Amino acid sequence: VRELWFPGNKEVVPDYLDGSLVGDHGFDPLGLGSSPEQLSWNVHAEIFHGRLAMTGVAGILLTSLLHKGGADVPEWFEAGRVYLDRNPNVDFGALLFSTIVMSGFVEFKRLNDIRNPGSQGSGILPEDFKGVGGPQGRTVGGPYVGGRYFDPMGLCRGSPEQTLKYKWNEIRNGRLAMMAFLGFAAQYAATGKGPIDNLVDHVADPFHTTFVHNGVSVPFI
Amino acid sequence: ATRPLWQPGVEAPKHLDGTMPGDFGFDPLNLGVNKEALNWYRNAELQNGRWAMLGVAGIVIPAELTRVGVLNVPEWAEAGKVYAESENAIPFASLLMVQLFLFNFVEIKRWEDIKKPGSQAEPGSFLGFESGFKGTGISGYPGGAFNPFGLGNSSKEAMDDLKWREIRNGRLAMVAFLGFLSQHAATGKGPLDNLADHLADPWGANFCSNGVSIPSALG
Amino acid sequence: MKDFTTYLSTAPVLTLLSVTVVAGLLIEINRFFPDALIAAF
Amino acid sequence: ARANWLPGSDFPAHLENCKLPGCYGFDPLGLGANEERLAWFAESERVHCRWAMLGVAGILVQEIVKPDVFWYTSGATVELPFDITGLLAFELFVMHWVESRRGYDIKKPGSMDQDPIFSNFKLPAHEPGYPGGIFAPFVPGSLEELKVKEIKNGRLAMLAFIGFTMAAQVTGKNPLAALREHLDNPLGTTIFSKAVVVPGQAVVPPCAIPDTIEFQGITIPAGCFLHSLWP
Amino acid sequence: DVAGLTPCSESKAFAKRKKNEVKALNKRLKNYEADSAPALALKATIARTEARFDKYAKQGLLCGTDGLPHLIADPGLALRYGHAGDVFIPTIGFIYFAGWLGYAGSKYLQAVAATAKPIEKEIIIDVPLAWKLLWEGFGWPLRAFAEYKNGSLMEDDAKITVSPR
Amino acid sequence: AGWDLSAEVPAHLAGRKDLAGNYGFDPLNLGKNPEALKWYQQAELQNGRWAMLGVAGILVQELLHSTGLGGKAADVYWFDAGNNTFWAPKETLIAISFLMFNWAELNRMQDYIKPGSNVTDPFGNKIKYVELGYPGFDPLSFSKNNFDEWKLKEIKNARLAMLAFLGIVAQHNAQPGSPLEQLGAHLANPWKNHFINNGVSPFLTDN
Ligand code: CLA
Ligand SMILES: CC(/C=C/C=C(C)/C=C/[C@@]12O[C@]1(C)C[C@@H](O)CC2(C)C)=C\C=C\C=C(C)\C=C\C=C(C)\C=C\[C@@]12O[C@]1(C)C[C@@H](O)CC2(C)C
Ligand SMILES: CC1=C[C@H](O)CC(C)(C)[C@H]1/C=C/C(C)=C/C=C/C(C)=C/C=C/C=C(C)/C=C/C=C(C)/C=C/C1=C(C)C[C@H](O)CC1(C)C
Ligand SMILES: CC1=C[C@H](O)CC(C)(C)[C@H]1/C=C/C(C)=C/C=C/C(C)=C/C=C/C=C(C)/C=C/C=C(C)/C=C/C1=C(C)C[C@H](O)CC1(C)C
Ligand SMILES: CC1=C[C@H](O)CC(C)(C)[C@H]1/C=C/C(C)=C/C=C/C(C)=C/C=C/C=C(C)/C=C/C=C(C)/C=C/C1=C(C)C[C@H](O)CC1(C)C
Ligand SMILES: CCCCCCCCCCCCO[C@@H]1O[C@H](CO)[C@@H](O[C@H]2O[C@H](CO)[C@@H](O)[C@H](O)[C@H]2O)[C@H](O)[C@H]1O
């Protein structure tokens, strides 16, 4: 049928993963999405995590590249402290409260859309914020929100093949970005340097600059 | 039915529907499930909103005038003490008892009106003034003596709009008074002073830096 | 997944989790606000 | 048609039967898949073409007439007859009027075709993005070939402007000055001669534009476009 | 002074107790280094002890002949002498939280009692329903008073089973 | 659509051709309710006429103060009229104004409640009523013909005067001198003096 996360072995592939979902490879050994509503919730969480990880990884990479060039851009693991230091008039609690409030407003809009697929496409919002659906055969709401604001270029409007290709691109890049952020955290905790720093130090000296020489992954070495 | 709700996408509870002014389907605690309890809470909301509106007006307008220069009055938290040290100042206990004695009569009469709207219109109750004590059918909206200018009497929809404006203003004033209390307790300054201090440096002057809202033990 | 969540909703599991959460909250309250003999507001 | 951006390839489905001028079937990302978006992008491309043509011509003429003035820093080194604030406000007001009229004409074809002051004058019927009438008092040749010429020249002008800004940020000289510098040593003045990256070392040309520029009493950033990303 | 009690601020026994506790802690601290873990722990304990004694003396607590704080459990007596936070306010706080938990449990039991299989709902709790009822239990005073004045908070004596005397 | 060729009339203003200066301008839909629009029309007429009188007075007084025609009373800024001394103090004048305005405004309100009712004076004199916001005080009989055109002129001049008064107050709170002095200071360059460099409106520029 479709490519699996483990060639052959159809027993490990769950029944609820029939291949209709984007990025479906039958991966669910722990059965964390056995329930239907749990599967829908996990789909929303996965796409949201992928987009958030892509944004964070892109920002971290760009800041690390700027820091290497000599710009007054701090590293990702110290950007918050640095900004708080150059701006002593900004209260940390105030910034946290503002972030929580604004994120709460948008997250509540998304949450209500999750509860009711097409309930936010009216009132104080146009029909564009109603969603186009997709997962679980839905035709409204979901993580894929079309419209003229979340898709100004209209890449998903016209030719379903292009829409499917872009959706696969998005999910694959999101998973890759999630793994990239995990690697960023592990590398910072082991070597204490940024991503670009680790990459340049490794390219300069391939052998002697692996995870075994950081002194953290392999303790006795 | 399809009127705006407090949380878009969430269906309003069946016990609220959409007839009372200010009905936005907001009842996460399901406090107004009982009809009698809902009616009592509606009357309580109207009373609290009107009293809060009067208090917030008497606290903001005099403060705004004082800031300009005309009409010099003390800050609302010190107004009670300022009058106490006056020469012919009435004792606090006597003043409070007189106010409570008058309020006892008026509030008990309003209480009887809540149980039965046409209660106070009983013939012979007063010296011919009971005729003007008949409500409009809903407790909390008594015409006659009250509403001497007859605003909103042109039609039923006109009165409904005014009721919505009254409920929104009352709720806003209630929240404003709670804010006044919290602001003065956290910062020993007036509302206008707090507003002016916040605009000067919003990121450095707010509830996160007053030292009271956020406990110092956590930090 | 449904059966697992149903098992987690059983009386013993919920009782232990609730007791653990309440105990943890009380421990942290006493850690940040220790020696609270009276209700000083 | 036979004119393709990639000979031997196949035009995209949405770009087939494309009547837009200068349509050579170039759309790898499929940005013109939607019909409405295609028209909006066509108007955007035409306006970009004309603006880039005007800008490139102006920069070249300014360099020829005044070779001692750097076009990149001309915004803060020209000595304005008026004031920068008043000039910006006047330009913003008139630009808002004209741009709003044009955009609304695109949204609704014949909505912005009547003179508001003189009721007797009205722009004749035309196609979106091509006003005509009083705007085109002289047409030397057929409209289709001239439209193709305009689109091609505009695309070339946009690429020319990008090359101008990049050469100014890398060499700090004017367009013709950089061209003369490249002519004096073609094998040493190319981007491959100044920049090169290898697994272990990277040579990035230094910025020829100051980090910050002082205008009037304030400071303006004006540095390099993603210098850290330069090869 | 309420019942022959002296404020802890002016109590000599209170100060002597604080001094003795700090003295014992310092005696134990003397057998360690200056920056070692036991030394830091003992110093933290000393700081906590001093802060506790200072807070008790500053809060206005009353101390007896033994030098230990005493609580006044009597409205009026505690309200006029500034001791409402000893038992009065804690009483209100408890009553509120206890009623909250009790009302939440009562509502959950009554809601699941209408289900076709209530015993299973009792051994296998409905987490979403329990969460909603726990949140609704915060308005327990208003709800309880409304139910009492409504007559739905009680069961008729003629409908409750009773022994044959 | 009159105020914007790309906009649409908010429906409640499409079938209302009897309103002076009806350009379909109501982006906030404040006049959707017929009663609300009826009250807003009277409010607009009152504000516009009062603004016309006030702006004309301020302009004439400042013109006489600058060129030099009025006595010591005119030789003063409009906002500084309190320094002048008249026949009665400020309190007496304010009280007299309150009483006279109470009488006139109550007559107008009675007419608003029931148009055509209050139209007779205590001495029996009567006038012909012609629409609500137009009581008929036309001693020159200028409304006999082209009434719609005349009221359109009135509404446009009223709106212009309202904007003029708002601008005068804003300029006074942001720029020094009289409105005519501000106009002259502007016309002096005028590429530098234009609220952008006043140091008050932008706020973000030079604090
Ligand atoms: C939090 C991020 C996240 C979330 C919510 C999901 C969610 C989902 N994934 Mg996905 N995945 C992710 C990250 C995520 N994934 C990453 C980073 C990769 C790259 C390795 C993949 C690769 C992948 C494949 C190949 C497939 C899926 C599939 C699915 C769907 C079915 C699986 C399921 O139901 O279990 C739900 C998953 C969770 C509830 C996450 C549980 C996390 C556990 C509890 C923590 C342990 C994680 C890790 C081992 C420990 C590191 C933590 C520590 C170091 C800090 C589901 C909607 C299948 C599918 O059909 O796609 C639609 C499928 O074929 N995923
Ligand atoms: C969201 C995310 C990262 C987002 C990062 C952000 C916003 C970073 C933000 C900032 O950096 C900037 C930009 C600037 C900095 O100065 C400050 C911060 C604030 C730091 C990563 C998620 C990262 C998420 C990851 C890595 C998830 C991995 C999950 C896996 C592998 C699960 C696999 C399985 O679950 C399945 C699928 C099926 C099951 O049955 C079996 C198992 C095996 C359990
Ligand atoms: C709805 C609901 C339902 C659901 O279900 C649940 C929940 C959530 C709970 C909810 C909510 C609620 C709320 C919010 C409440 C609040 C209230 C208030 C605030 C009130 C006030 C209220 C308020 C008020 C009355 C007030 C009043 C005031 C006053 C008189 C004042 C007075 C004064 C003055 C003048 C001056 C002087 O010098 C001082 C004084 C003496 C001070
Ligand atoms: C088509 C497509 C589709 C597919 O699918 C995908 C993709 C690939 C994405 C695509 C492509 C794209 C592209 C290529 C783009 C580009 C563009 C440009 C370049 C623009 C410019 C554009 C440009 C422009 C406008 C420019 C302009 C200019 C100007 C005005 C100038 C001005 C000036 C002058 C005169 C002089 C002075 O002293 C200075 C200044 C002021 C400076
Ligand atoms: C339409 C609409 C609708 C949509 O939907 C929305 C929106 C947009 C909101 C809108 C708009 C609105 C507006 C604009 C308004 C405004 C108004 C005004 C400005 C008024 C004034 C108004 C104004 C006024 C009355 C004024 C008046 C004045 C006066 C009397 C003056 C007096 C005087 C004089 C003679 C002289 C002296 O020495 C001083 C004095 C004593 C001071
Ligand atoms: C079948 C049984 C399992 C076979 C594989 C087991 C491998 C698992 C990890 C083994 C490493 C852990 O054991 C580790 O041994 C190394 C190698 O001697 C010791 O290392 C020591 O000797 C090495 C070289 O011999 C020196 O360079 C080093 O300075 C010294 O510390 C570590 O101190 C000890 O921690």
Report how far apart the first and last C-alpha atoms of chain B are (Å, whole number).
Answer: 48
User: In degrees rounded to 5, what are phi and psi of residue D198?
Assistant: -140, 155
DSSP classification of residue B89: P
- Count of B–F CB contacts within 8 Å? 3
Q: Is E136 on the interface with B (CB under 8 A)?
A: yes
Long-range contacts of D211-215 (CB under 8 A, 24+ apart): D213/D73, D213/D76, D214/D76, D215/D75, D215/D76, D215/D84
Q: Cα–Cα distance between B120 and B143 in angstroms, integer?
A: 13
The region, left, alpha or beta by phi > 0 then psi within -120 to 50, assigned to residue C35 is: left
| C-alpha distances in Å from residue C14, one per residue of C6, C27, F199 | 11, 20, 64
Which of B105-119 are b and which e, b meaning 16 or more Cβ less than 10 Å from the residue's Cβ? eeeeebeebbeebeb
CA distances from D23 to C41, D12, D127, D139, D140 (A): 76, 11, 17, 22, 22
Beta strands in E11-143 (DSSP E): 62-63, 69-70
Handedness of CA A97, A100, A105, A106 (dihedral sign): positive
3-state secondary structure of A42: helix
10 Å CB burial of residue B139 (0-12, 13-18, 19+) is buried
Chain F contact for B151, CB < 8 A?
A: no
SS3 assignment, position B214: coil
Shortest Cα distance, chain F CAs vs residue D48, angstroms: 24
Q: What is the Cα–Cα distance from D212 to D223, expressed in whole angstroms?
A: 6
What is the sign of the dihedral through the CA atoms of A179, A183, A186 and A192?
negative
Q: Where are the beta strands (DSSP E) in D6-59?
A: none
Do residues C16 and E35 lie in contact, with contact meaning Cβ atoms separated by under 8 Å?
no
Say whether D7 sits in a helix, a strand or coil: coil
What tokens were used for E35?
């920056």
User: ∠ CA(D148), CA(D151), CA(D153), 5° rounding?
Assistant: 105
Cβ–Cβ gap A69/D199 under 8 Å: no
Cβ–Cβ below 8 Å for E147 and B34: yes
What residues 85-114 of chain D have any CB closer than 8 A to a CB of chain F?
Answer: 85-87, 89, 104, 107-108, 111-112, 114
What residues contact residue D97 under an 8 Å CB cut-off, 6+ apart? Answer: none
Do A146 and A164 touch, CB atoms closer than 8 A? Answer: no
Helix axes B92-115, B35-68, angle to 10 degrees: 140
Q: How far apart are CA E112 and CA E90, in angstroms?
A: 33
In this structure, the number of other CB atoms found within 10 A of the CB of residue F165 comes to 18
- Helix, strand, coil percentages (3-state) for chain C, rounded to 5, are 70, 0, 25
Write the burial class of residue A63 (CB in 10 Å: 0-12 exposed, 13-18 middle, 19+ buried): buried
Euclidean distance between CA atoms C36 and E111, whole angstroms:
38
Helix (H) or strand (E) holding D149: helix D143-171
Method: cryo-EM
Spell out the SS3 assignment of A116-153.
CCCCCCCCCCCHHHHCCCCHHHCCCCCCCCCCCCCCCC
Give residue for tokens 């209408």. E114
Task: From residue D159, give the alpha-carbon distance in Å to each of D25, D187, F5.
Answer: 19, 23, 37
Task: Choose among A45, A14, A10, A17: nearest CA to A142.
Answer: A45
Atom of ligand 5 nearest to the CA of F81: 38
d(CA A99, CA A101): 6
Tokens of D83: 């004031």
Q: Is the C-beta atom of B29 inside 6 A of ligand 3?
A: yes
Max Cα–Cα distance, chain F, nearest Å: 66
Is some CB atom of chain F closer than 8 A to the CB atom of D17? no
Q: Report the alpha-carbon distance of residue F128 to residue F123 in Å, rounded.
A: 16
Residue A51: name the closest of A183, A195, A173 by CA: A173
What's the rounded Cα separation, in Å, for the pair D164 and D53? 13
Strand pairing category for E6-7 and E62-63: antiparallel
Q: Check E93 against C38: CB less than 8 A apart.
A: no
* Letter string b/e over residues D27-66, b meaning 16 or more CB atoms within 10 A of that residue's CB: beebebbbeebbbbbbbebbbbbeebbebbeebbebbeee
Count contacts between D and F (CB, < 8 Å).
27
Residue A94, chain B, CB below 8 Å: the answer is: yes
Preceding peptide of E69 cis, ω within 30°: no
Q: For residue F77, give the ligand 5 atom closest to its CA.
A: 38
Is chain F in touch with chain E: ≥3 Cβ pairs within 8 A?
Answer: no
> What are phi and psi for residue E7, nearest 5 degrees?
-60, 140
| Tokens linked to A216 | 């953290």
Sign (positive or negative) of CA dihedral B45, B48, B51, B57 = negative
Q: Is the dihedral of CA A16, A21, A27, A33 positive or negative?
A: negative
State how far the Cα of B161 lies from the Cα of F67, in Å rounded to an integer: 53
Give the span between the Cα atoms of A34 and A28, in whole angstroms.
9
Residues near A21 by beta carbon (within 8 Å), at least 6 away in sequence: A43, A135
Tell the residue number behind the tokens 């089973």, with chain if given.
E161
d(CA D164, CA D175): 6
C6: nearest CA partner in chain A = A35
Ligand 4 neighbours by CB, cut-off 6 Å: D 26-29, 31, 48, 51-52, 55, 58-59, 62, 71, 74, 158, 161-162
Of F6, F196, F197, the CB nearest to D104: F6
Name the one residue in this structure whose structure tokens are 């000039």. Answer: D87
d(CA B203, CA C4): 46
Resolution (A): 2.7
Positive/negative CA dihedral, D89, D91, D94, D99? negative
Q: Give residue ranges with CB within 6 A of ligand 1.
A: A 5, 17, 21, 23-28, 32-33, 39, 42-43, 45-46, 49, 175, 178-179
| Ligand 4 nearest-atom number relative to CA D78 | 38
- List the one residue out of D86, E160, E36 whose CA is nearest residue F186: D86
The reply to whether B158 touches chain F by the CB within 8 Å rule is yes
As given in the structure block, the two tokens for residue F84 are: 């002048």
- Interatomic CA distance for residues E119 and E113, integer angstroms: 8
Q: How far apart are CA B122 and CA B139, in angstroms?
A: 16
- Structural domain range at position E161: 1-165
Instruction: Confirm if A33 and A18 have CB atoms less than 8 A apart.
Output: no
| Ligand 1: nearest atom to the Cα of A42 | 57
Q: What total of structural domains would you count in chain E?
A: 1
Our CA angle for A33, A37, A41, nearest 5°, is 70
Burial class (CB in 10 A: 0-12, 13-18, 19+), D167: buried
Distance between CA atoms of F201 and F197, rounded to whole angstroms? Answer: 8
As a CATH number, domain D13-229 is 1.10.3460.10
Phi, psi (deg, nearest 5) at residue E62:
-100, 135
Residue E152 CB-density burial (10 A; 0-12 exposed, 13-18 middle, 19+ buried): exposed
Judge if the beta carbon of residue B27 lies within 6 A of ligand 3.
yes
Report how far residue E66's alpha carbon sits from residue E17's, in angstroms, rounded to the nearest whole number.
9
The number of C-alpha atoms within 13 Å of E10 and in the hemisphere containing its C-beta is 4
User: How far off is chain E from B29, nearest CA to CA, in Å?
Assistant: 4
Count, residues in chain F: 207
- E with B: touching (≥3 Cβ pairs within 8 Å): yes
Please report which helix (H) or strand (E) contains residue D196, including its range. strand D196-198
| CA-closest candidate to residue D157, choices D25, D3, D43, D46 | D46
Q: Whose CA is nearest to atom 2 of ligand 4?
A: D27
Kindly tell me the sign of the dihedral angle through the C-alpha atoms of D93, D98, D99, D100: positive
Mark yes or no for CB contact D227/A69 under 8 Å: yes
